Write an enzyme that holds these catalytic residues in place. Structure first.
Site, PDB file in Angstrom:
ATOM      1  N   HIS B   1       1.482  -1.453  12.672  1.00 27.26           N
ATOM      2  CA  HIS B   1       2.581  -2.229  12.104  1.00 27.26           C
ATOM      3  C   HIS B   1       3.018  -1.710  10.717  1.00 27.26           C
ATOM      4  CG  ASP B   7       9.507  -1.120  -0.886  1.00 24.12           C
ATOM      5  OD1 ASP B   7      10.636  -1.096  -1.434  1.00 24.12           O
ATOM      6  OD2 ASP B   7       8.555  -1.795  -1.338  1.00 24.12           O
ATOM      7  NE  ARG B  10       6.798   2.781  -0.699  1.00 21.85           N
ATOM      8  CZ  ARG B  10       6.398   1.957   0.274  1.00 21.85           C
ATOM      9  NH1 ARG B  10       5.437   1.067   0.050  1.00 21.85           N
ATOM     10  NH2 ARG B  10       6.973   2.007   1.475  1.00 21.85           N
ATOM     11  N   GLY B  34      -4.897   5.994   0.546  1.00 18.92           N
ATOM     12  CA  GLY B  34      -4.067   5.130   1.388  1.00 18.92           C
ATOM     13  C   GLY B  34      -2.740   5.763   1.787  1.00 18.92           C
ATOM     14  CG  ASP B  56      -4.330   5.039   5.247  1.00 19.44           C
ATOM     15  OD1 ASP B  56      -4.874   3.946   5.511  1.00 19.44           O
ATOM     16  OD2 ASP B  56      -3.259   5.132   4.615  1.00 19.44           O
ATOM     17  CD  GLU B  85     -14.802   2.255  -1.622  1.00 15.63           C
ATOM     18  OE1 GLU B  85     -14.120   2.499  -0.600  1.00 15.63           O
ATOM     19  OE2 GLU B  85     -14.287   2.087  -2.755  1.00 15.63           O
ATOM     20  CD  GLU B 103       2.669   1.738  -1.507  1.00 20.00           C
ATOM     21  OE1 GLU B 103       2.976   2.800  -0.889  1.00 20.00           O
ATOM     22  OE2 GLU B 103       2.896   0.575  -1.091  1.00 20.00           O
ATOM     23  CD  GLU B 112      -5.367  -9.548   0.986  1.00 17.80           C
ATOM     24  OE1 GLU B 112      -6.181 -10.062   1.781  1.00 17.80           O
ATOM     25  OE2 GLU B 112      -4.141  -9.403   1.234  1.00 17.80           O
ATOM     26  CG  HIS B 254       6.055  -3.858   0.223  1.00 16.92           C
ATOM     27  ND1 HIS B 254       6.146  -2.686  -0.496  1.00 16.92           N
ATOM     28  CD2 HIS B 254       4.742  -4.192   0.232  1.00 16.92           C
ATOM     29  CE1 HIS B 254       4.944  -2.336  -0.923  1.00 16.92           C
ATOM     30  NE2 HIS B 254       4.073  -3.227  -0.488  1.00 16.92           N
TER      31      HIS B 254
END
Lengths: 311, 311
Positions: B1, B7, B10, B34, B56, B85, B103, B112, B254
């Site tokens: 999704h 964006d 962005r 990410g 990612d 990690e 980001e 988050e 967003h």
């Protein structure tokens, strides 16, 4: 988060089905699958049920217990945490219920629905002749003009700041869109293509759904997508039927509509007949995903095929 | 999704920060935390990086690998699956990187977010003097008039079809709203209240954030809420600064804005001074939740207190 959803069209329909039928609810034993904060339990208690059992997950059941207590129905409404599958038996030695309330409809009726769960609760607990509120849903499909959205959100992937994001376009086409469409975009007649009657349907019937649709083009236009929705009826129980729609001609619901983008736009002329086949099944790799395949012809021409996965 | 989120505000900012600084990216080793489908990796490769490493989760990395290959940069861009990690070391024996793209900003900047993850990747891998794209964010807060939304969506819980849903009202007030507000709703000056500089901030600084704000009322009006947003700067690296805002005066992102509804509306007069304290910390019960407490005065009057949990 779900504890704050407001869907007036939805809740108003349940309210009329229950509170306009106090004669029916008086001293019944009502089971509410997925009760949330408890409003439908409250309707059932206010309608005169003698016992309401609501099921949902731990955190929201805690809130509903407080709402039931503030509204004076703790003596009537009992709320249990967990999944229907994990409940060995109903509280208080109750073995059968007279009425099952649920909100089983998912997106596109069948994506992430509670249908399997309600059928299982029915088989386990509904008395013969008992009522499912609601018990019938009918699905409709038609063709729309939607080129602005298709150009802006699907063709967009061909040139992303000069880069080729085609691999994403294939996925955009494969994923049905849960979104509102304006009724003025519809360019064909509307076709009924599925009915689900909770009074008679069996779990085995839902492993492979194979059905058909047929509609007629009303314009000279390119068709970018088919849109589908469902209407819902409280058919057995009420003394006058209660129903609501999730279609684009009436007020929106949180179900919106489901949009199936065609890989290639369909050139339509007035009175062109589009005849098609829809198969629906649970995805084999991820059972929470829904496989939807369509095949259709225009005036009996070559078969156009398209496959979708709702994820 | 998430693979289909668009964006423009962005992405346009990152694009200018990278592609307007080819001189800086030429033969650097870039790490993208990410990376998603890989557009920022592509910008970095097009800007002349000699090596781009994108991180990612499994399924989206599979799609990005195809997009990188279709765009001719497999020799430059390497994409690895997993969490920072859980990565014992970077590929190919690489031990240090020159630039970290991320980001990291979450809703309300810190809900988050990937902030802890980027700081850890920085400490592990960034060369002294290396660049974080972007590296500074500043948070702003102001007061708004929002009575229509408050009446329709918060007071709504006092009378739900005749039933008392007050217990839900307390939760609605406690949960900050991530939503757009119109700039014309602002009734006070705007206050800077937090700065995060990834060049210097340390993980320990984020266990308890204690800061202040001050703004002045411009009208005779009731204030229903404070709205907050953040601006973002690519400060070290670019040859002319690149920045964008998530506020209500410019195009939406967003991230939208974050709205903090007051328990009791604040009677404001022109030139009333509102001075306040904001503390932010990770929730002890659920570390993914954010505790935000506010305390403020108007012209030095009694302290009004309010506590929020972003969940």
């Amino acid at each position: 988060h779900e504890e704050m959803l407001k869907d007036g069209i939805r809740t108003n329909a349940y309210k009329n089905a229950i509170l306009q039928n106090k004669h029916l609810f008086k001293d019944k034993v009502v089971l509410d699958i997925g009760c949330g904060t408890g409003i439908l339990c409250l309707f059932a208690a206010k309608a005169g049920a003698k016992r309401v059992i609501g099921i949902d997950m731990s955190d929201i059941i805690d809130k509903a217990r407080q709402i039931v207590s503030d509204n004076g129905y703790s003596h009537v409404i009992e709320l249990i945490k967990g999944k229907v599958e994990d409940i060995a038996q109903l509280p208080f030695g109750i073995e059968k219920v007279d009425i099952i309330i649920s909100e089983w409809m998912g997106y596109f009726l069948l994506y992430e629905s509670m249908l399997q769960t309600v059928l299982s609760a029915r088989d386990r607990w509904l008395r013969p002749g008992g009522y499912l509120f609601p018990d019938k849903c009918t699905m409709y499909i038609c063709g729309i003009e939607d080129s602005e959205y298709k150009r802006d959100k699907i063709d967009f992937w061909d040139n992303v700041y000069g880069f080729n994001f085609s691999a994403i376009k294939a996925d955009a086409l494969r994923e049905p869109l849960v979104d509102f469409v304006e009724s003025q975009q519809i360019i064909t007649t509307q076709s009924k293509f599925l009915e689900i009657d909770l009074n008679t349907i069996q779990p085995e019937d839902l492993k492979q759904i194979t059905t058909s649709f047929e509609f007629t083009s009303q314009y000279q236009e390119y068709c970018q997508a088919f849109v589908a929705w469902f209407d819902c009826v409280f058919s057995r129980g009420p003394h006058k039927p209660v129903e609501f729609s999730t279609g684009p001609f009436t007020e929106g619901t949180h179900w919106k509509q489901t949009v199936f983008y065609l890989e290639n736009d369909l050139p339509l002329k007035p009175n062109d007949v589009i005849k098609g086949t829809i198969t629906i099944s649970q995805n084999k790799s991820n059972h929470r995903d829904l496989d939807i395949s369509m095949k259709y012809t225009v005036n009996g021409g070559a078969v156009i095929s398209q496959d979708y996965i709702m994820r």
